[PDB]
Amino acid sequence: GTPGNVPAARTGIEITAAHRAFFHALPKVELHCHLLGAVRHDTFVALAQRSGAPIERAEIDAFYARGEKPVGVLHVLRALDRYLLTRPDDLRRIAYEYLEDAAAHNVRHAEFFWNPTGTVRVSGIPYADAQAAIVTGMRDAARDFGIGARLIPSIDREQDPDEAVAIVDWMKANRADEVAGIGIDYRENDRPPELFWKAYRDARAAGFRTTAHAGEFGMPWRNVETAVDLLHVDRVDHGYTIVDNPELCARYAERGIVFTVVPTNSYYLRTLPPDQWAERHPMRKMPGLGLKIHPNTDDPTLHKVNPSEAWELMFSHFGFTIADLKQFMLNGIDGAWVDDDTKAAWRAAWAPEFDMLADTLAADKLAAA
Ligand SMILES: [Zn+2]
């Protein structure tokens, strides 16, 4: 098969065991992953059985089925909030298990999204208890697997902008080194980023970094411009439609804005014909427009893609070379929400590591031959 059940590669590159070992060994950061999109199937089962959720073993499997013109998985996230996640400890568990799974693929630093609005308003778990539980999961995973992490409470853009302000209020009342900034997600259509100006102002005034989903679902490149130049985000999530405006691309290339990208993005898989998906995905054109991109899983267990596979897809389907992948690694370091000393250390250490893995890929290929 193919990672994420995406269309089969039409590029002539045959992925070998050597390639898979390379993609696996690559040191990685992950900057775009939703906690609730990283729940293991069997943990989903355990949560459902304990909560008595109105979801049977087979309803759980349409949830985890990843088809050829795949539907978006936002409804699964909604089901988790409404029926499955009923105690703070459930949030601890899924954070710990996500970080364990990321670490297994040599993710050394993961920044992940969680929507507090759903947890507080729908699950009925107080913010303070929810955040503490997630932070415990993070600290346990650092202890057990050596993976570092940041939590990014994220605005549910389908709810009123007052709920977004409420998140920043919660964050200010519960400061923790693990909690680094805010994002915004859920359905972008008709919920433009400027609607949430107040929460972004408040987050930045409180010393938090910010990011935003923008230009997904074919939404206008204007949304990317608004995120960067009104909300003043530190990085952008997706950003695909920016390719429609090469002038803006030039400006943001010069500013070095990092764009988190998701090869398994459901919208493009669903809307592009399978024979044109890899060819016409705007992500393919972004680096040539001068933009710094960085590949990620988004919803790894629901998209059926792990970090090693997300990196593989860039090479197998999207025409990016080994050298391009080294740049993407460096882009992830630049985009991470850590201090300059940490970034410098990662550049100095991971670049030579990458170089050795690239030489070993060549040696492994020769040995297979
Ligand atoms: Zn996302």
Side-chain angles (χ1 to χ4, degrees), residues 32-38 73-82 85 91 94 112-127 130-131 134 151-159 163-164 166-168 170-171 179 181-187 196 200 211-213 237 298-299:
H32 189 152
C33 185
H34 303 266
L35 182 60
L36 271 59
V73 305
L74 299 184
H75 64 112
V76 180
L77 273 65
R78 296 296 187 195
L80 278 156
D81 280 346
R82 190 168 295 281
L85 300 169
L91 295 169
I94 62 171
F112 62 95
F113 300 131
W114 158 60
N115 304 98
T117 303
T119 298
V120 179
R121 310 298 190 207
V122 177
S123 313
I125 300 172
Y127 184 89
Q131 192 196 266
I134 295 168
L151 177 60
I152 305 174
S154 296
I155 296 160
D156 178 349
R157 77 200 303 152
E158 297 178 28
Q159 319 316 325
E163 293 294 343
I167 292 172
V168 183
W170 283 325
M171 291 168 64
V179 182
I182 64 161
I184 186 166
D185 54 46
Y186 279 106
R187 191 176 177 257
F196 302 90
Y200 279 79
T211 187
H213 283 54
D237 303 303
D298 207 5
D299 304 283

Side-chain angles (χ1 to χ4, degrees), residues 232-252:
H232 304 298
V233 298
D234 298 287
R235 60 180 188 237
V236 175
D237 303 303
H238 298 303
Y240 308 122
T241 55
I242 199 187
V243 303
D244 295 337
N245 186 337
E247 316 100 70
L248 203 53
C249 286
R251 292 186 184 280
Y252 296 172

Side-chain angles (χ1 to χ4, degrees), residues 215-298:
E216 195 182 0
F217 313 102
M219 289 299 99
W221 61 259
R222 260 161 68 266
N223 285 1
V224 183
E225 182 187 30
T226 297
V228 175
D229 292 326
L230 180 69
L231 303 186
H232 304 298
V233 298
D234 298 287
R235 60 180 188 237
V236 175
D237 303 303
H238 298 303
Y240 308 122
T241 55
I242 199 187
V243 303
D244 295 337
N245 186 337
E247 316 100 70
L248 203 53
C249 286
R251 292 186 184 280
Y252 296 172
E254 180 175 49
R255 284 163 61 183
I257 304 307
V258 176
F259 292 77
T260 70
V261 301
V262 179
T264 55
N265 179 254
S266 300
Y267 175 81
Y268 286 117
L269 281 167
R270 187 171 58 248
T271 58
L272 297 177
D275 83 318
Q276 270 193 287
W277 168 78
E279 287 293 314
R280 290 308 305 272
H281 202 307
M283 178 188 68
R284 190 190 189 96
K285 306 168 172 81
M286 291 168 82
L289 280 163
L291 306 176
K292 292 188 173 188
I293 73 177
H294 176 258
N296 290 273
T297 62
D298 207 5

